[PDB]
Structure formats: structure tokens, C-alpha cells
Amino acid sequence: TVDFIKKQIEEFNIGKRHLANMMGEDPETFTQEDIDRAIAYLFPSGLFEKRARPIMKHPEEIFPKQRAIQWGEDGRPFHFLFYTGKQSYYSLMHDTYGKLLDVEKHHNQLRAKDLLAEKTKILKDPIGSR
């Protein structure tokens, strides 16, 4: 569906140019804020659900995000955790555990050398971190 999105990009661009021409504003200065107002004025659909109103955005915004091509033309998958079901989540967990082990080794070396230069940054109450 890559070519479909590629064609939708060109159609969105030409439609934005035509919308700017028919609205009378500069297409170079034409933005999504102007697009929303132009759509609302040209197609005044009165509905309580905002997602039911007509919308014209970029294809990457309208169409949902797509999973990348997991394997090459030879059939070999790219990521080494492809056969684990959730390659992204498992890679994130593996990276987190590797960083935890690296931090543990570095802290062990610092304690052996009697060096304590780190501080406690976990408490983020005044910032409001979740």
C-alpha cells in the first residue's frame, strides 16, 4: 500500500493548491489551520461527533501508521528479534536490560575505586513526572 499513500500525497498536494486557489489565500502561506477553516466553511456538516465531519489531512495523518517491511527480498528478516512476536517491545526490553547491566558494572567499578559522583535523580515530584 506504499504506492497508494504515494499517490494520496500528490492528490492531497493538488487538492490543497486548488483549495487555496478557490479560497483566495496564498498557497505558500496555506497551512492546516487554514485547511480546517476552509473545510468547515465549504462543507458545513453539523454533527456531534467531530470525527464524522469532513477532514482533509496528510495521508500519514489520515491513514494509520504501517508496520515496516520486516524482511528483505531474500526473505531474511532485518531485526534479530523478528521471530519473538513483538520485535520492537523485546528490543526495547533487551536494550533496557543491557543498559542496566552496564550501569551495574560501572557502579561496581566506581565502588571498587571508592568513587561516588552520582546523585539521586529519581525524585521528580516538583516537575510532575509520570
Partner 1 sequence: NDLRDRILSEPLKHADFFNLKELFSVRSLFDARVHLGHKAGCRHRFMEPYLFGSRLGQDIIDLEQTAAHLQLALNFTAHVAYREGIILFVSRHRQFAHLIETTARDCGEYAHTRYFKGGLLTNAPLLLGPGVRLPDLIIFLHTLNNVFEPHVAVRDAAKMNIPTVGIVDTNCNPALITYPVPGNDDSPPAVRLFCRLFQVAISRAKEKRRQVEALYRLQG
Partner 2 sequence: VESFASMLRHSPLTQMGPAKNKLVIGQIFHIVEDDLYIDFGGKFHCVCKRPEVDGEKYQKGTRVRLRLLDLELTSRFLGATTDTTILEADAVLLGLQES
Q: What is the crossing angle of helices 2-23 and 32-42, to 10°?
A: 70
Member of 6, 17, 86, 111 binding partner 2 (CB under 8 A): 111
Return the one option of partner 1, partner 2, none that residue 112 interacts with (CB less than 5 to 8 A, by type).
partner 2
The yes or no reply on residue 84 touching partner 2 (CB under 8 A) is no
- The grid coordinates listed for 109 are 567499578
Which residues of this chain interact with partner 1, rule CB under 8 A?
70-71, 74-77, 80-85, 90, 94, 97-98, 101
Q: What are phi and psi of 33, to 5 degrees?
A: -60, -40
Q: Which of 77, 103, 100 is nearest to 88 (CA)?
A: 77
The yes or no reply on residue 112 touching partner 2 (CB under 8 A) is yes
Site residue total, partner 2 (CB under 8 A): 4
